[PDB]
Each structure stands twice: as C-alpha cells, then as structure tokens.
Amino acid sequence: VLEKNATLLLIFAFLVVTIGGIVEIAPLFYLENTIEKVEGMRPYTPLELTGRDIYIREGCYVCHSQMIRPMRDEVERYGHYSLAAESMYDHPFQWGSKRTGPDLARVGGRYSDAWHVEHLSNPQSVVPESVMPSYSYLANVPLDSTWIEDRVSTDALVGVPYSAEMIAAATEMDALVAYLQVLGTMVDFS
Amino acid sequence: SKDEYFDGVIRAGVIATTFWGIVGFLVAVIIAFQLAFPALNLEFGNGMLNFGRLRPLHTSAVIFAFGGNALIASAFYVVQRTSAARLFGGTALGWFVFWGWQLIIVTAATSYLLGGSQGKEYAELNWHLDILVAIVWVAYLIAFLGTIFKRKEPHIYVANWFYLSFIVTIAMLHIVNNLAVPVSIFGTKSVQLMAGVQDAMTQWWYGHNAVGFFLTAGFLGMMYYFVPKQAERPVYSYKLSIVHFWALIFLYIWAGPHHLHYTALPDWASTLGMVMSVILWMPSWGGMINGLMTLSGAWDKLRTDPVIRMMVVSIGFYGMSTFEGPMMSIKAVNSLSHYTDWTIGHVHSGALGWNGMITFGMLYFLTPRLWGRSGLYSLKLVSWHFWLATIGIVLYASSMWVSGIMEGLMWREVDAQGFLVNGFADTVGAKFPMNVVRGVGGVLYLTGGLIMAYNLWATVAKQPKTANLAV
Amino acid sequence: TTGHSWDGIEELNTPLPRWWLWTFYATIVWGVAYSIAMPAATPGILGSSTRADVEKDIAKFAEMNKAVEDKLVATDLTAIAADPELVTYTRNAGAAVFRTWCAQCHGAGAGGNTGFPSLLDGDWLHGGSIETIYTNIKHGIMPAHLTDELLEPAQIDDVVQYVLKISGQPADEARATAGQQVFADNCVSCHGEDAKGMVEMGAPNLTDGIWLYGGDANTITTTIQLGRGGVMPSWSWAAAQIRAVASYVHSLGG
Numbered sequence: 001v002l003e004k005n006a007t008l009l010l011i012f013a014f015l016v017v018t019i020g021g022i023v024e025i026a027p028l029f030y031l032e033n034t035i036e037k038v039e040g041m042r043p044y045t046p047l048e049l050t051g052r053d054i055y056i057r058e059g060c061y062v063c064h065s066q067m068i069r070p071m072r073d074e075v076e077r078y079g080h081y082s083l084a085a086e087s088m089y090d091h092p093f094q095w096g097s098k099r100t101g102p103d104l105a106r107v108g109g110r111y112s113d114a115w116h117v118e119h120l121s122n123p124q125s126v127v128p129e130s131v132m133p134s135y136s137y138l139a140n141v142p143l144d145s146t147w148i149e150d151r152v153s154t155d156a157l158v159g160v161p162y163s164a165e166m167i168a169a170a171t172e173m174d175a176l177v178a179y180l181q182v183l184g185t186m187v188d189f190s
Numbered sequence: 191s192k193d194e195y196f197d198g199v200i201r202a203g204v205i206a207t208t209f210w211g212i213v214g215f216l217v218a219v220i221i222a223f224q225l226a227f228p229a230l231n232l233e234f235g236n237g238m239l240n241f242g243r244l245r246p247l248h249t250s251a252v253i254f255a256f257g258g259n260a261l262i263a264s265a266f267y268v269v270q271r272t273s274a275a276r277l278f279g280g281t282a283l284g285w286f287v288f289w290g291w292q293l294i295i296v297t298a299a300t301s302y303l304l305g306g307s308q309g310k311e312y313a314e315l316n317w318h319l320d321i322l323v324a325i326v327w328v329a330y331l332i333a334f335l336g337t338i339f340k341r342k343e344p345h346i347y348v349a350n351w352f353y354l355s356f357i358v359t360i361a362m363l364h365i366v367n368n369l370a371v372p373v374s375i376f377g378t379k380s381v382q383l384m385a386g387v388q389d390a391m392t393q394w395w396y397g398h399n400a401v402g403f404f405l406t407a408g409f410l411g412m413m414y415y416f417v418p419k420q421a422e423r424p425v426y427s428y429k430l431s432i433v434h435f436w437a438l439i440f441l442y443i444w445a446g447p448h449h450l451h452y453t454a455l456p457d458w459a460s461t462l463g464m465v466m467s468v469i470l471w472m473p474s475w476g477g478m479i480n481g482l483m484t485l486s487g488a489w490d491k492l493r494t495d496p497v498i499r500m501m502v503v504s505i506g507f508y509g510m511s512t513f514e515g516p517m518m519s520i521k522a523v524n525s526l527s528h529y530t531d532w533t534i535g536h537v538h539s540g541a542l543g544w545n546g547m548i549t550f551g552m553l554y555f556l557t558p559r560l561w562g563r564s565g566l567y568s569l570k571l572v573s574w575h576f577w578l579a580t581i582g583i584v585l586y587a588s589s590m591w592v593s594g595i596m597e598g599l600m601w602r603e604v605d606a607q608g609f610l611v612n613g614f615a616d617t618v619g620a621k622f623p624m625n626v627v628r629g630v631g632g633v634l635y636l637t638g639g640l641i642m643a644y645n646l647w648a649t650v651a652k653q654p655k656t657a658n659l660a661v
Numbered sequence: 662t663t664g665h666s667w668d669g670i671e672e673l674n675t676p677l678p679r680w681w682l683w684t685f686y687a688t689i690v691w692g693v694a695y696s697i698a699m700p701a702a703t704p705g706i707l708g709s710s711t712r713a714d715v716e717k718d719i720a721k722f723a724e725m726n727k728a729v730e731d732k733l734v735a736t737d738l739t740a741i742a743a744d745p746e747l748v749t750y751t752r753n754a755g756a757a758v759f760r761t762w763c764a765q766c767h768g769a770g771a772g773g774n775t776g777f778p779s780l781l782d783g784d785w786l787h788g789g790s791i792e793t794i795y796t797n798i799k800h801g802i803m804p805a806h807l808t809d810e811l812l813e814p815a816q817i818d819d820v821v822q823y824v825l826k827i828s829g830q831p832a833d834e835a836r837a838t839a840g841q842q843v844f845a846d847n848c849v850s851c852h853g854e855d856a857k858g859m860v861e862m863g864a865p866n867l868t869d870g871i872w873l874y875g876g877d878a879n880t881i882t883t884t885i886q887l888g889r890g891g892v893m894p895s896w897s898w899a900a901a902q903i904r905a906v907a908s909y910v911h912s913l914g915g
C-alpha cells in the first residue's frame with residue numbers, strides 16, 4: 001500500500017528521485033578526464049575574467065554556444081571539438097544550448113580586436129544581416145576592478161589556480177574583447 | 191471549526207497566475223520580435239530592451255511566475271479538496287508563500303534586466319534570491335505536506351503523489367544546482383560551485399528535472415484533479431497511475447545527459463541519459479493515456495465545454511512533446527536538433543500546448559469556485575481563447591520545426607568537394623521567416639491570454655464576500 | 662471502480678493497456694541492448710566505440726576528398742586559379758571556403774567595407790601576385806604622427822590635405838604647402854613620393870581612386886594622427902584550404 005502512510009510515501013519519493021543524481025553527478029567529481037585542465041592552460045587573466053562576467057551579464061550565452069561537437073562539419077566550421085579539460089576553470093560553464101549566433105568556443109584569434117569592437121558596437125554595421133543586439137554601452141563603461149581580487153580569490157577557493165601574485169596584480173568593451181580572444185586558445189597552443 | 195476551505199491564497203495565486211501569464215508571454219512575444227527585428231533591441235544604451243537580458247526574464251517569469259503561480263493555486267485548491275481539510279499553513283504559512291513568491295518574481299524582474307544572472311538556465315537568479323526561494327519553498331512544502339498529514343480520508347489521491355513529488359524534488363534540485371560562493375551582493379555575484387563538464391551535468395540534471403517535476407509532475411497533479419472533475423462519472427486506470435507515477439518519478443532524474451549529447455560530457459553519462467530518456471517515453475504516455483481514456487464516452491462534452499477542450503488538447507500536446515523528447519534524446523537525432531530552433535519548438539510545444547493549456551483549463555474551472563461563482567463570465571470567451579491558443583501553439587511549433595531542421599541541415603550540409611555548403615549567416619537568413627511566424631503565433635496565444643484576463647476580470651467583479659458557503 | 666472518492670473523483674481499476682505495456686518493456690529491452698552495445702560491444706569499432714567516430718568521419722572524408730585537395734596542392738596557385746577543373750572548382754569551393762571563413766571581414770561579395778580590403782578589385786596593399794596573396798592568407802598581416810613632435814595638431818591637417826591632392830584635388834592652400842613638405846620628409850619613406858606605396862610594407866598607394874577607405878579629409882586626419890594597425894589573421898592554424906582560397910582570391914580579379 002503505502003498509500004495511507006505520508007512518511008513512507010515521502011521517504012520512498014526522496015529515495016526514488018535520488019538515484020539518478022547520485023549515479024550521474026557524483027562519479028564525475030571523481031573522474032579525472034573532466035577534472036584535468038589542458039596542460040598548457042592557465043586561469044583567466046583578470047581582464048579576461050572580468051570580461052567573462054560581462055559576457056555572462058549581457059546574456060551572450062543565450063545566442064552563442066561554447067561547445068564544439070565531434071562532427072566533421074562542425075569541426076570544419078568551428079575548429080577542434082571542445083574538450084572537457086578546456087572548461088575545467090569555468091564557474092559557471094558557458095557551454096551553449098542554442099546557436100542563434102555561431103559557436104564561440106574557439107575564437108582563439110579568428111578575428112581582430114578591432115573587428116570585435118566594431119561588431120559589438122553594432123553587429124549590423126559589420127554583418128548587415130545580423131540578428132545580434134548592439135552593445136555600444138560596453139564602450140561607455142569603465143572597469144574599477146575593485147571586485148576582481150575578490151572574484152579571483154573566490155575562484156581559487158573553488159580550485160582555480162590563481163597565484164596570490166595573480167590577485168594582487170589584477171572599458172567593458174576591452175574586457176569583453178579580451179575574454180573573446182582567449183576562447184579555445186588553450187588547446188591550440190598547448 | 192475552520193471547517194471551510196481556505197480559498198484565500200488560492201484566489202490570490204490564481205489572479206496572479208493570470209497576471210504573470212500576461213507578463214511572461216508578452217515578454218515572449220517581444221523577444222521573439224527582437225529576433226525578427228533587432229531594432230526592438232536598444233541600439234545605443236543597454237537600457238530596457240536587450241535580448242540577452244530579457245530572455246531569462248521571459249524564462250523565469252513564464253516558468254516560475256506563471257507556471258509557479260499556477261502550481262500554487264492548483265495545489266492549494268486541489269489538495270484541500272482531494273483530502274477534504276482546510277490548508278495546514280493557513281493564511282499564515284500559505285499566504286507567506288504567496289507574498290514570498292511574489293517577492294521572488296519581483297526580484298527577478300528587477301534583477302535580470304539589471305544584468306545579475308548566474309547564466310545557468312532556469313537557475314539564473316542570484317544567490318540572495320536563491321536563499322529566499324529556498325525559504326519560501328520550504329514553507330510551501332510544510333503547508334502542502336501538512337495538509338496531507340491532516341487529511342480526512344485514509345488514501346491519498348495520486349494527484350498529490352505528483353504534487354508531493356514535484357515539491358520535494360524541486361527543492362532538492364534547487365538547493366544542489368544553486369550551490370555557489372558569493373563574491374558580491376548580487377546579480378551573479380556568485381560563482382558556481384562546479385565547473386566544466388561537472389557543472390554541465392549538475393546544470394542539466396537540474397534543468398531537465400525542472401521541466402520534469404515543475405512542468406510535468408506538478409502539472410500531472412493538476413491534470414489528475416481537473417480532468418476528472420466533470421459531470422460524467424468514472425473511466426480511468428488506477429494501476430496505470432501507480433506504474434506511470436513511480437516509473438516517471440524514478441526514470442526522469444536520469445534524463446539529464448540528453449541535453450549534453452556529443453559534448454565534453456563523458457560518453458557513458460550521455461548514453462545513460464539517452465537510454466533512460468527513451469524508457470521515459472512509456473511512463474510519460476501513461477499520464478496522457480490515463481488522462482484521455484478518462485474522457486471516453488464523455489467526448490460529446492468536448493464540443494459543449496471548452497474548459498474540457500483545453501484540458502484534452504493539453505494532453506494531446508503533452509503526449510506529443512513527451513514523444514518528441516525521447517526521440518531528440520537519441521544521440522543521432524540530437525546531432526541534428528541540438529542548438530537549433532527545434533529545441534525551442536520542443537519547448538513551446540510542451541510549454542504552450544501542455545503546461546499553459548492545462549493550467550488555463552484548471553484556472554477556468556477553479557476561479558469561479560474560489561470566487562464564490564457558479565461559473566466563468568462568458569463561456570464563449572473560453573472557446574475563443576481555446577482557438578487562439580491552439581492556433582498560436584501550432585503555428586509556433588510548425589515554424590520552429592521548419593527552422594530547426596533547416597538550421598541543422600544547413601549547418602551540417604557538405605558539398606561534393608567536401609566543403610561546407612552554407613555560411614552560418616545563410617542559415618540565419620533562412621530562419622527569418624520562421625522568426626516572424628513564431629512571433630505571430632506567440633502573439634496570438636498572448637492575445638488569448640488577454641481574453642482570459644478580460645473574462646476573469648469580469649467574473650471577479652461580481653461578488654465581494656465570495657466564501658462560497660461551506661466550501 | 663474503487664470504493665474511495667476524493668471529492669467527486671473516483672477511479673476505475675483497469676488494466677494497463679497491452680500496447681502500453683509492450684512499448685514500456687520494449688524500451689527497457691532497447692536500453693539494455695544499447696548499454697551492451699555501447700560503453701559499459703558493438704562491432705565495427707575496435708576497442709570500444711566513443712566519440713571516436715569523429716576520427717572515422719574525418720578519415721572517410723579524407724579518403725573521399727583527399728585526392729581533390731592533393732591534386733590541387735601540386736599545382737601552382739596561379740595554375741589553380743586558371744583551370745576551371747581545379748581552378749573552377751577552386752573558385753566556386755575556394756569561393757565556398759571563402760564564404761564560411763573570410764566573408765565576415767571581407768564581405769560576401771569579397772568587396773570589403775571600411776576597415777577591410779576589397780579583394781575583388783585590382784588594388785593590392787601587400788601585392789597582387791599569387792605568392793603574395795597566399796602569404797597574406799597563410800601567415801596573416803602606420804605610425805601615429807599626431808604625437809611625433811613636429812607633426813602635431815597642424816602638421817597632421819596639412820599632411821591630410823596634401824594626400825587628398827595626391828589622390829585628387831581639393832582646395833586648401835595652407836593644408837597643401839605644409840603637407841607636401843611633411844610627406845616628403847616622413848610619409849614618403851613608406852608610401853613613396855607621389856604615393857605609389859610599397860607592397861613590401863603593406864603601405865597602400867596614396868594615389869588612388871575612390872575606394873571604400875575613408876577618403877575624407879577628417880578620416881585621413883585620424884589615420885595620420887593615430888595611425889593604422891589593421892590585422893589579417895593567419896589561416897595557417899585555422900585552415901590545403903589556404904591554397905584553394907589563394908587561388909580563388911587571385912581568380913577574383915580577372
């Protein structure tokens with residue numbers, strides 16, 4: 001029965017619901033492949049980290065994927081298919097779910113900073129047909145980097161290898177471009 | 191005493207359900223239009239309308255605010271009646287859940303456009319909001335489970351199995367996926383506990399199960415109460431209820447990796463997701479069968495009662511999506527479907543067709559009763575609403591399928607020489623008509639929502655003091 | 662029907678639908694089969710299957726189209742532009758490759774825009790020869806006179822006006838004398854006298870017709886003030902394809 005018993009039903013539900021989570025999530029913490037960074041890779045530089053946060057704030061993810069699937073055509077279009085090691089540092093992970101715009105994972109030099117500036121400033125200007133929104137404010141706002149130290153410290157706590165030295169050492173458009181320029185670079189050079 | 195059901199909270203949640211429905215769907219239409227014509231985005235100045243920011247607002251408002259309020263109103267009404275006792279938290283605990291929830295949505299409205307988002311889908315709100323939601327949800331479970339504990343009848347209606355499960359699992363999912371170290375006060379001024387593949391897994395476990403419990407299970411509870419609520423008597427299958435419920439509740443949690451196909455996530459996990467997503471097909475359909483078969487003999491009612499129409503059609507879309515989902519969960523299919531508008535097609539088929547329609551019908555049924563009214567102000571409007579909503583959903587789905595297939599194909603398509611046939615821009619251009627049609631379909635559905643608002647309002651006007659006697 | 666009512670609702674004790682049962686069981690069976698077949702096997706892939714299929718996809722593709730690329734590679738770039746077999750397939754596909762990779766900077770037309778060169782036309786900054794174009798593609802890609810004390814606020818204006826005269830004829834007498842003098846001193850070294858320009862440097866000729874580049878006096882003032890600094894990213898990492906593209910770009914003008 002157990003129809004009648006509130007506690008039993010509750011307990012069984014909690015138990016029934018748990019198995020998939022334990023089975024899928026938990027073992028990942030342990031598996032090395034997903035944990036290991038690409039050997040060459042380093043953590044995001046403070047400007048790039050700030051830019052990544054901007055990429056998050058804006059909602060770039062909502063149109064842009066950062067995960068190259070292992071198919072020939074996407075390899076051809078984007079580059080080497082993404083590797084788990086690349087995303088090891090990413091709190092939170094940027095893999096997309098939608099590609100209104102093209103995949104961003106490996107823009108490890110593909111465009112010049114100047115291009116990125118013009119495009120972000122007005123995508124239509126460079127790419128007339130673009131659906132992408134214009135982000136001119138990025139030029140307007142400067143970064144104080146007050147918070148950057150805190151952010152890196154927190155990431156270190158999270159496991160990112162920032163040096164004490166890195167924290168100490170650390171426009172929005174500049175940051176965004178800086179971030180975009182790093183993407184996927186780690187694998188190619190290593 | 192207190193023999194009378196506490197209609198209070200259900201009334202508030204119902205009205206707010208309609209309100210948030212309008213707000214969320216309107217944002218949906220607007221952002222869709224933004225995809226069609228980017229001008230709708232502010233060119234200079236981030237401002238008020240920018241797609242990247244608005245999108246999660248649409249998401250949260252539609253799911254948590256609209257769907258959430260629908261769930262609150264429905265669960266509070268349904269559990270009370272199904273168990274025959276007045277709500278356990280009462281105005282105090284339950285109303286707290288109301289205001290608290292309202293605060294949560296309001297905070298989302300302010301915070302998201304402001305730019306504070308974790309970037310995690312369906313997770314987007316900042317940590318402070320996460321704590322608030324955890325608190326409100328905790329209160330909500332105490333009220334609900336308490337209501338069950340206090341029940342009169344020895345057995346607990348299956349609808350409550352679904353609601354109860356939904357409650358618990360969402361709480362667990364929310365807490366786990368939200369672990370994050372706070373860097374600053376808000377926005378995503380927190381970084382997620384996990385990273386990379388692991389973060390992706392936790393995210394999609396959370397993300398699927400969100401629709402799985404929040405959108406499917408809880409709504410299945412709604413279906414279980416409302417569909418059988420009719421003049422016609424018995425036709426159902428209890429044993430199915432049992433099999434379908436447990437199997438769904440168990441199997442669904444495994445479905446997470448289907449999002450992750452052909453990604454960095456390890457092959458084993460992806461496969462487990464695929465296999466279980468396929469097994470998931472059966473229980474999910476068990477829900478639809480249990481709902482529809484109940485109607486058997488009763489079908490003549492469909493022409494007569496539009497509320498019934500809504501519930502039935504709701505199940506039709508539900509089954510359709512619950513079929514399409516398992517298919518897309520196959521790696522080969524996902525190979526095409528992923529990152530295309532098809533995913534969106536799938537989402538709105540379930541969203542407009544299943545969730546929205548059943549909640550709609552649910553409200554049309556309950557709101558008069560809660561309001562101390564025999565029925566809605568105008569049945570005709572419910573019918574018109576039904577049509578508007580149906581054509582809108584179908585149009586939305588069709589456009590997205592065409593767009594999605596076109597995109598996956600165009601992206602993958604290779605020439606004789608082996609070169610890539612289309613530029614991404616070409617695919618983008620191909621998508622435009624799809625964007626416009628989708629904008630229209632969503633617009634029509636939204637208009638239907640407006641008609642609902644008008645009708646409900648008219649009915650709401652009739653009586654102050656609408657205690658509806660004993661009940 | 663069962664004995665207990667929940668507010669109105671009662672439930673029939675009915676059997677699970679046979680088809681429903683079958684489908685449920687079938688899915689389960691499929692799942693077990695899938696797991697045995699997948700990671701835990703399937704034939705056709707040695708070891709264990711994985712995303713490894715990628716290698717196979719590329720490999721078969723390579724077998725299928727390796728010859729076309731290999732034939733082209735032996736041929737010189739100039740030859741690969743001329744020949745409609747390789748040469749024509751090189752323009753359409755090279756043109757195919759062009760759209761995917763290059764079109765976003767140099768235009769679908771390859772006509773270019775402000776800040777990016779028009780590949781179609783006759784004029785080449787780095788040099789039009791096949792080797793030059795290839796080099797541009799394979800290995801990828803103006804001094805700030807405003808600061809150099811002498812140039813200043815006025816010197817820049819003068820040089821701008823003079824260059825517009827080299828390009829054509831506007832009327833500003835102060836902006837001309839001074840500018841001629843400055844150009845001969847500094848600019849001429851890279852752009853030459855009479856602005857033929859030097860391909861080696863990628864210094865464009867000042868004696869040009871109306872192009873997409875900011876001809877206006879003001880725009881010239883800005884480039885002279887601040888200097889240029891444009892990049893053509895290297896396709897050697899990202900990109901055989903580079904060769905076909907060189908053949909296509911070459912074919913474009915003529």
Ligand code: HEC
Nearest residue numbers: 111112762763766785786787788794797863891892893906
């Ligand atoms: C944006 C980052 C570009 C990418 C993508 C492509 N090109 Fe480019 N190219 C770009 C610029 C800004 C310039 C001018 C650089 C300068 O001197 O200031 C160029 C130049 C070339 C040239 C040389 C033209 C000449 O006058 O000699 C060639 C042959 C060329 N680009 C080819 C080319 C190809 C084939 C591309 C796709 C693989 C491509 N470019 C991409 C900017 C950008």
Ligand code: HEC
Nearest residue numbers: 058059060063100101102123127130131132133135241242
């Ligand atoms: C939804 C609409 C968006 C938003 C929210 C973002 N982008 Fe994009 N983006 C979009 C489209 C349709 C395109 C293709 C047309 C074009 O190139 O303009 C792009 C393109 C880019 C690119 C170039 C990618 C490439 O060609 O390799 C980049 C680098 C890019 N977008 C960046 C970017 C950033 C940083 C965003 C947040 C500010 C952003 N995009 C949002 C569509 C959309």
Ligand code: HEC
Nearest residue numbers: 803806820847848851862863864865874875885889890891
């Ligand atoms: C040495 C290197 C020099 C010096 C001494 C001068 N120029 Fe400039 N110039 C040079 C290059 C390599 C380029 C191309 C820049 C690029 O493509 O990014 C240029 C460009 C110009 C232009 C722009 C042409 C255009 O609009 O596309 C102008 C107007 C120009 N240079 C003028 C100019 C003047 C007036 C100079 C003396 C003050 C001068 N250059 C010096 C290389 C070099």
Ligand code: HEC
Nearest residue numbers: 215218219221222252253533534537541542546632635636
């Ligand atoms: C749950 C209820 C729900 C309702 C009701 C709803 N949506 Fe959405 N919408 C979603 C979800 C979930 C997503 C995110 C999809 C994703 O992330 O793949 C979304 C995303 C979107 C997007 C972004 C599409 C893209 O390609 O990025 C648009 C546009 C949209 N919805 C339009 C609409 C319109 C128009 C309506 C008209 C009624 C509507 N929505 C109603 C749930 C809903």
Ligand code: HEC
Nearest residue numbers: 097401448449467470511512515516518519528537540541
């Ligand atoms: C709202 C109703 C709804 C129902 C019912 C539903 N899903 Fe979905 N589906 C969604 C949403 C929302 C997303 C988008 C998630 C995202 O943003 O990536 C989605 C996307 C998917 C995708 C594509 C993921 C990707 O990125 O390629 C698959 C596969 C999927 N769901 C499987 C299923 C399965 C399996 C079921 C049931 C057996 C199911 N769906 C039922 C809402 C629903």
Ligand SMILES: [Cu+2]
Nearest residue numbers: 397398445449
């Ligand atoms: Cu899912």
